[PDB]
């Protein structure tokens, strides 16, 4: 592999350059919100983001060295976590609001339009407030998102040694960014721990999000895309 040869600054520039774009929703402010329309907006947006996430996954250092089967497995376990951390990242500068798209800004009262969604909304907002509290930086965010891709499905598989080697390099990168920011060694270890413990909450939100997605699928209310259905069946 070549990912093992990149320095910390080269790891950051590779992750920053691979960042997906910010997509717009088909949201029309003239339409009154229904449970079926609001779910349709969010699920349509998520489907289009999934296509960009797949091509973003290829540019994450070390991901192409894996077999095609292992690439599918990691993405199948992590896709909702990656969508959620992306959502809470771009919602950081909007307290009490989730920025699904630049034209789709929603608060917890809007989430009441869809049954069982406010529970997900509150957790997403709490993650966003935590990031804003910690003053999460873009360089740290792209490191955390790459960790999720490589770590979430790694406990459900010699290829694991390569993945753990890449994960260690990302850890070296996180520590390098924190030392560069003037943090003492104690603060570097403490901030590293705080950032990685949030991934436990993100896994929790993904688990609840899957169950919420599965319920809306069985209700046949929201039209789900074929790609999103396959990602949903992978968790069952």
């Amino acid at each position: 592999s070549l990912a093992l040869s990149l320095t910390a600054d080269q790891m950051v520039s590779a992750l920053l350059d691979a960042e997906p774009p910010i997509l717009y929703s088909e949201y029309d402010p003239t339409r009154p919100f229904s449970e079926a329309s609001m779910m349709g907006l969010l699920t349509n947006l998520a489907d289009r983001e999934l296509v960009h996430m797949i091509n973003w996954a290829k540019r994450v250092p070390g991901f192409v060295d894996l077999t095609l089967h292992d690439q599918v497995h990691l993405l199948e376990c992590a896709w909702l976590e990656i969508l959620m951390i992306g959502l809470v990242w771009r919602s950081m500068e909007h307290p009490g609001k989730l920025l699904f798209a630049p034209n789709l800004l929603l608060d917890r009262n809007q989430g009441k339009c869809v049954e069982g969604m406010v529970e997900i909304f509150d957790m997403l907002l709490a993650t966003s407030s935590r990031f804003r509290m910690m003053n999460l930086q873009g360089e740290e965010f792209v490191c955390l998102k790459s960790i999720i891709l490589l770590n979430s499905g790694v406990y459900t598989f010699e290829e694991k040694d390569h993945i753990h080697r890449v994960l260690d390099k990302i850890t070296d990168t996180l520590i390098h960014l924190m030392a560069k920011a003037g943090l003492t060694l104690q603060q570097q270890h403490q901030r590293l721990a705080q950032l990685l413990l949030i991934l436990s909450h993100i896994r929790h939100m993904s688990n609840k999000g899957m169950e919420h997605l599965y319920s809306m699928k069985c209700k046949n209310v929201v039209p789900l895309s074929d790609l999103l259905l396959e990602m949903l069946d992978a968790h069952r």
Partner: peptide, 10 residues
């Protein structure tokens, strides 16, 4: 093969 399988191969 799955859709994710196709999108990952080119």
């Amino acid at each position: 093969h799955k859709i994710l399988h196709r999108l990952l191969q080119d």
